[PDB]
A = this chain, B = another copy of it.
């Protein structure tokens, strides 16, 4: 199904304000993406709070499931949420007690998605891999999409690659809510994810981010 006001190529405008371990920051983002191919890119710039005293990687998943390749046999809740848009809320529970919450209100004007992003993280240990900037990248992940109390819900077993090829686990819970009433909820399905920083300066004040996402029903069909 389609009926989408979404174009094969869309612009992305993003502004994130947040606070991690008492450090405030504001980050602007501008990029493009192909929603029906599940890919998007963005140029990020730290406007306030730079250089960040924590690992930039923890913010990257907050920098839109519209950019996910959905097959025909799986309801695309996110592309059906427009032109009105949708919003999501997220909790990030790291294995060393660090906990983050995030929210994003996504709207659309013409060919541009607008993202109002907030990010708050607490209880990160001073000598943990986040505050010591020992993270290398997010590993590829698979988000489990299901309905809980009438709201589409995604749980992810995530892992940050660390120096020395160790890993730093993080459990993600996201709730997605369309702004329009009556948007049909999808059945249980999986969404493969891979997010990557293509380039960045030394202090991570400027970052180029990329993500590729594909929805599927899992084995043994797809």
Which A residues are within 8 Å of any B CB, using their own CB? 19, 21-22, 87, 89-91, 93, 97, 99-103, 105, 118, 120-123, 125-128, 139-142, 144, 146-151, 155-157, 159, 161, 165-167, 169, 171, 173, 175, 187-188, 190, 192-194, 212-214, 217-222
Contact sample, A vs B, 22 pairs, CB 8 Å cutoff: A22-B87, A89-B122, A89-B123, A91-B99, A91-B123, A93-B93, A97-B173, A101-B121, A101-B122, A139-B144, A139-B218, A140-B190, A142-B190, A147-B165, A155-B157, A156-B157, A159-B188, A167-B188, A171-B171, A192-B222, A193-B218, A193-B219
Point out the residue from B105, B128, B219 that lies within 8 Å of A214, measured CB to CB. Answer: B219
Q: A141-B144, A157-B155 are in contact. Are A192 and B175 (CB under 8 A)?
A: no
Report yes or no: B101 in contact with A125, Cβ–Cβ below 8 A.
Answer: no
Report yes or no: B167 in contact with A149, Cβ–Cβ below 8 A.
Answer: no
Q: Is the interface of A mostly helix, strand, loop or mixed?
A: strand
Report yes or no: A165 in contact with B141, Cβ–Cβ below 8 A.
Answer: no
Query: What is the CB-to-nearest-CB distance from A136 to chain B, in angstroms, rounded to a whole number?
Result: 11
A120-B120, A141-B144 known; 18 new pairs, CB 8 Å cut-off, are A22-B105, A89-B123, A90-B122, A99-B99, A99-B101, A99-B173, A101-B120, A118-B120, A123-B175, A126-B150, A140-B217, A141-B218, A142-B190, A142-B218, A147-B167, A156-B157, A165-B187, A167-B188
Tell me the nearest residue of chain B to A194, going by C-beta: B219
Report yes or no: A175 in contact with B91, Cβ–Cβ below 8 A.
Answer: no
Report yes or no: A144 in contact with B157, Cβ–Cβ below 8 A.
Answer: yes
CA distance A81 to B105 in the complex (A): 40
